[PDB]
Amino acid sequence: TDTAHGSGIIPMRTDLELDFSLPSSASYTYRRQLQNPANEQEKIPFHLQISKQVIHAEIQHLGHWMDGTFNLKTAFHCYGSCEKYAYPWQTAGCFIEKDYEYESGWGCNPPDCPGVGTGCTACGVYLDKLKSVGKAFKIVSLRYTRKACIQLGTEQTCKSVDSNDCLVTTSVKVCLIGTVSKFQPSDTLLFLGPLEQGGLIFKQWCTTTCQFGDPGDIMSTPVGMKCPELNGSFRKKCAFATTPVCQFDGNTLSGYKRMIATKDSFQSFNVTEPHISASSLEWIDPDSSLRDHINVIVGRDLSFQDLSETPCQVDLATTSIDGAWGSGVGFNLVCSVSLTECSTFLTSIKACDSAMCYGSTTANLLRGQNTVHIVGKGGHSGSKFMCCHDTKCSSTGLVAAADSDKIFDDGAPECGISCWFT
Amino acid sequence: TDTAHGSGIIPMRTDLELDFSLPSSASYTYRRQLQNPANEQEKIPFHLQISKQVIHAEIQHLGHWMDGTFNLKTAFHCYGSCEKYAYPWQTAGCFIEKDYEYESGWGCNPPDCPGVGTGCTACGVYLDKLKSVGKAFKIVSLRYTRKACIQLGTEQTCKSVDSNDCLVTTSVKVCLIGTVSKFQPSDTLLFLGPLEQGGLIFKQWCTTTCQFGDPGDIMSTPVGMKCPELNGSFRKKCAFATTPVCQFDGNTLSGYKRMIATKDSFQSFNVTEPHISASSLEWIDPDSSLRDHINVIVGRDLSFQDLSETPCQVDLATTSIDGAWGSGVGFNLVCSVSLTECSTFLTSIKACDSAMCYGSTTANLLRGQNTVHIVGKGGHSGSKFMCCHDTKCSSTGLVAAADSDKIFDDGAPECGISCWFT
Amino acid sequence: TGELKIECPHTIGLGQGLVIGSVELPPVPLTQVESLKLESSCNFDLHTSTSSQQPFTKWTWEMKSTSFQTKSSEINLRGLCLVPPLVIETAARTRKTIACFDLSCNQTACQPTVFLIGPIQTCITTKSCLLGLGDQRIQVNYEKTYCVSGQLVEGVCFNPVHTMALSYDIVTVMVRCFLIAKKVSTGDSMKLEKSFETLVQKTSCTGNGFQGYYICLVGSSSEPLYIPTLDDYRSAEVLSRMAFAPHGEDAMRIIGKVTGKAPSTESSDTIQGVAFSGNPLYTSTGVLTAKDDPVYIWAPGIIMEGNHSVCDKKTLPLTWTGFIPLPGEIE
Amino acid sequence: TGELKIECPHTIGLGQGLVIGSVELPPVPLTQVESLKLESSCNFDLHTSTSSQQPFTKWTWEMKSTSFQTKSSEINLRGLCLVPPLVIETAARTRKTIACFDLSCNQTACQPTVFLIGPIQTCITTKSCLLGLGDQRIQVNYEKTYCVSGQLVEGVCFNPVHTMALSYDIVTVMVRCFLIAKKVSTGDSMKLEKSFETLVQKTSCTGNGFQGYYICLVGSSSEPLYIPTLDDYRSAEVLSRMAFAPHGEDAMRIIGKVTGKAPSTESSDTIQGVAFSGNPLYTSTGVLTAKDDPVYIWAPGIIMEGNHSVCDKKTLPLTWTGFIPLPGEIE
Ligand SMILES: *[C@@H]1O[C@H](CO)[C@@H](O[C@@H]2O[C@H](CO)[C@@H](O[C@@H]3O[C@H](CO)[C@@H](O)[C@H](O[C@H]4O[C@H](CO)[C@@H](O)[C@H](O)[C@@H]4O)[C@@H]3O)[C@H](O)[C@H]2NC(C)=O)[C@H](O)[C@H]1NC(C)=O
Ligand SMILES: *[C@@H]1O[C@H](CO)[C@@H](O[C@@H]2O[C@H](CO)[C@@H](O[C@@H]3O[C@H](CO)[C@@H](O)[C@H](O[C@H]4O[C@H](CO)[C@@H](O)[C@H](O)[C@@H]4O)[C@@H]3O)[C@H](O)[C@H]2NC(C)=O)[C@H](O)[C@H]1NC(C)=O
Ligand SMILES: *[C@@H]1O[C@H](CO)[C@@H](O[C@@H]2O[C@H](CO)[C@@H](O)[C@H](O)[C@H]2NC(C)=O)[C@H](O)[C@H]1NC(C)=O
């Protein structure tokens, strides 16, 4: 018992060229039936399956981003020089010292030390509580790959198409030419927590002249610590008959603190299925912010005679149902697809009713029995859902009671207004 | 004196994305005027210039293709063995010998030598008149590059965009993603004469099992000669009381002869501006049989304030004309373009009249006077041709009496039927 | 009233953890320091060790007209954080609470820092209670944690790695450590300053014989961590941070180098440091590294020498507060 | 009537070029070979050298019952291509035409190959004319070339490189060469077979004393090319093709090895070769390489030894026809 739920029939009078713009986290399923222009009853299946985008980024390990606390201390001496004694800030992890050597007058002098031009006033800015807050990587190069499978008549061919490669067969050619990317080289990816949580994108990550407060000021490189300088100047505040204290009118908040303050002003990104090594970082972008340009061309010299002997026979039967026919609940259909006269055959099964088809599922069937699950949403009260191939469907169906990041394009003519609100 | 011959004005409410499919031997010129959505009178020029396609093919030098003549000789001996004496064919360049050692009966024996099982009949197939007919190269890898220049407001940026690279600026991004190619790896390019004359494409170029008649049978490799075997078998034709002659029922014509016979059954190609080295072969395909997919995107955060201070002023004046206004003869116009307040500015001048514009010429002007030639075809009897920028044109024009592999796209509204046959 | 906050976990778990909190109080005059007694109204079992009399060499400086006169004498203090061996290590089992203070002093005034350590069961028995020190009242507040599996660290809920093998997120946590005097009869296993010297020295120091160790608590609650535990990554981290910040991690005016006799009965100088004035910043208590038998020092207005690269006249602090990065999971 | 085609260039040009053509005629019986005289009705100035009497050793084989009997004797031939030194080299200046034949023979019959060489001016004076040889008439046809700058080679118009320095298309052209006997008093500059031996030998041959050289014409017209000219790429090419195809480049039945005495007055064998029957294929004339003074051989039914790798009993052919690749431009 078959029903008119076939695929788009395309006569091969001329070559079949196609251009695609695949989103980042999207898998395409384009299938038609190429018709011999010399015989209306000679048709061969053509299936095109393209996977998601795999982003391969050769990166440079920048290290760990450290967060510290600002501290300032002052050290006064009556006689000697500033380069004679030691100070507790000189032994810290990061420290910057500005000393007023031989600048002991009398207005800044304490009640002790009745001398002029003989003392020393050293000021030390150091950072404590250094703790790692995230990991930083720098993009060196980018590479985008997609896995494509074709099914023409009885032939099946698969390949991982790169930017400098194409899946070329005797009749079909699939090329990957362009890629619009959110990421580009010389960018800095910062992961605050683990990888799966995503991260942020920084462009002006300081490398040579880092200051306290800039993104990347304090870094825990594998060679050692890399401390920045300060954004400000020193000054000596003093009163009469008091020890001269040291002031610093500059930036006090660290780079991580300012980043948390204005985190909304930076670019965010997510990752899925991450794989990081000592040289690369592979992941799939789920935000669908990248587009790949794919060119497919099928010549009209298909030789319909060679692709017609012993085609792939497919039988199916609906065996189980679970869910509801309401628009929003969804139902799950189980099909027992039996493939014969072919070792492997790439096609797709649809869950159809008397009128429409509310779901599809692409699967590479093996010679024998195959269990296929199909998800669907919609239907009416008396909708008897069945499993369906191109034209042939199951003998019986089942009835129910009371997105997925896949794209299906089979060229089937959808039902008009007669199937709306019935 | 200006006239409404402006470019396409595009309001920047949203981002400007574009997809291009450039032919092989084609240069594109896309220019518009991006308008500030907050001020109708704030417009900045946007120019996009893309050069022709440069095909870089890392090749393998196969050597020279040799052409020879088929020859067969026979040598008979009464006593001894076939591996005892020498033959004149053994010292040739290419030779294949099949001998009937110890097979001397009596029906094939001459009037002399009344013996049985003691003679020797050697047969030698050799090739003479070996002369080179062409050079062969084998494609190992392919690479396609295009040089792109952008002009946005007062900024100018150029780069050679590869397949793994993009011209990325603060507001414009140009990427090269896909390339539909007539050539693919493992192909054999054969040049009969010099490079500029073009060549042929061979797929089944014999490498391991070469036979006389196949493309690539006799090769003059730099290491030495590489001789093939023969497509046939030997036999001994003999009569009573006569010396046994040797026959060869096989292929006699050489590989070059058969290639000349069925030359029309092979793929041909042309080259322009060739550059060959010990490892590569660079050329531009003039047949326009390759297509490059380019993605251009301009963000709407153009900051029209920064790109408005001190724009590029351009003055022009028509100074010479030469040709006719007939549809087919053509005319050449000379313009004296004066660029001020900018060091370098990329734009294009058009040869327009009261109604239409019959030609254009893109040039990167320098600060000062610039002589620009513009070719045009068309016009009427009273057509006073003038030089024109976006809006401003020259003060006067000139009148005449009695393709180029460039593509121009400025978005200007062409004249309707009012300019046809007037 | 000061505030001593205790962060309470949701469960007791594996039994051997302690809670810890601490607060630095306002300055008291020096003359009052010798009278300071910790009082408690809390419903816990105070360990009596720390409130006994404990002999210190007091080392002080005065301006003179290098420009300094120093002097020293032996006095008895009480209530300081001189914890005997095993007391902290077995507190979870004994159900004893340790409450003691350290002193951060200039010439004229001291800020006591009160430390409270005790069993996690205290979190069941107690919401708040009071300690007194001289004329100051301290409100201890036991507060239940925002987190489900860990502790609130830098405004983030964190659980550190637990396995004994090698395998994560990284969070910086507070560590608080107490110096414990502990001798053995034979060998160098307890020569704590030798451990520092191997980490930060070029050449061989002759005589750094102090015998003891640090016992530390990590974050607001943990099991005790013994320093040094040679194959423990956290011990290594604490020791390295100690070696670079020997007075702990977190205006004071430096005057110059001073020396003195500890104990005061020594004929020559056995200690050095840096005299300062202004606001006390570091703790003013430690032990000489040179003597097997601990010589305890209280040096108000002097940062006693703690640089481990020096050979002579150096000290170890009685308490030490710093931060170490831990690998784990943020949740 | 045979046909001897001369391809005529559009211009004379630089003055020193010659035209050349050749044709192989049908078989004549051996007894008639000694009577053969070239006659000419052509309007050109025949050089008289080649029609004089020239002494050859005739070397022949017969079946016997290794299975061969060979014999030899001294006879005089006329009209063969034994060209004196300078005759071809200066023919453009002297305006002399050389017409002579070589012989390709089996035991019973010979095919003469007639060679005609002469000044390019003949192309102005002459459209066609007649040569006779015995009972055969030969039609010489002078035909103007399809090309503008070069010569019709393999159906293609070709012009070779002209510069003396090093710098193209590659075309294979015919070369025809004549052996010239020329002695010097002192040294090895004219020892032609030594040149072959350096190119194709492992070890040292003792006695290959023939003194002479080849003079060659390239294509249908060229200046004479002297072999060997040591630094000339074309000389190198001709010599290498000679070394691999010593009887020239282009059913015959091989019978076996034979030896003989040349001249016949020698007490032992001085020559070897391979006896054959059937259609004559190679020329049957040459010179012994062993003697300074040329010993000319005519060996009908025998391919005389020309393999340069052999040391003894070998020969050089009187004429040699082959092909070499030339660099140039196809147009
Ligand atoms: C050891 O450290 C202690 C504590 O850090 C320190 O003693 C304190 O010094 C400050 C300032 O030197 C004292 O502050 C005073 O507080 C009273 C309280 O009412 C104020 O009225 C005073 O104000 C006057 O003085 C200021 C002088 O600059 C003026 O700006 C102001 O307008 C007023 O005229 C005054 O600030 C504080 O009382 C003491 N604290 C104690 C506990 O005694 C001490 O100096 C350090 N010792 C050494 C030797 O460095
Ligand atoms: C030296 O070379 C010469 C020339 O290549 C060669 O002499 C020639 O031999 C052929 C065949 O052996 C002779 O051909 C004959 O021609 C006459 C002309 O009318 C024919 O009638 C003959 O035909 C009969 O013989 C054939 C035998 O197979 C039959 O097939 C046929 O039907 C006829 O019965 C015959 O073919 C030719 O005449 C001579 N040429 C000359 C110039 O004498 C000679 O054999 C070679 N010598 C040696 C020793 O090898
Ligand atoms: C810790 O002590 C050592 C040894 O006294 C100090 O090291 C010296 O420091 C000065 C200046 O930094 C150098 O010129 C010397 O060469 C160092 N000597 C040695 C032996 O290392 C070190 O500076 C002290 N650290 C402090 C005061 O923080």
Ligand SMILES: *[C@@H]1O[C@H](CO)[C@@H](O[C@@H]2O[C@H](CO)[C@@H](O)[C@H](O)[C@H]2NC(C)=O)[C@H](O)[C@H]1NC(C)=O
């Ligand atoms: C030319 O002469 C040489 C020497 O007689 C021949 O070389 C010998 O050839 C045989 C078989 O090819 C080899 O086994 C010997 O080792 C060769 N000897 C030397 C010394 O090279 C050569 O074959 C002859 N060429 C012919 C008859 O064409």
Ligand SMILES: *[C@@H]1O[C@H](CO)[C@@H](O)[C@H](O)[C@H]1NC(C)=O
């Ligand atoms: C990452 O995923 C979260 C999930 O809620 C989403 O809100 C966010 O927009 C995603 N990031 C981007 C850059 O789209």
Ligand SMILES: *[C@@H]1O[C@H](CO)[C@@H](O)[C@H](O)[C@H]1NC(C)=O
């Ligand atoms: C090469 O150029 C010639 C010029 O006439 C043209 O006829 C030919 O078609 C070109 N080759 C190809 C492959 O288009």
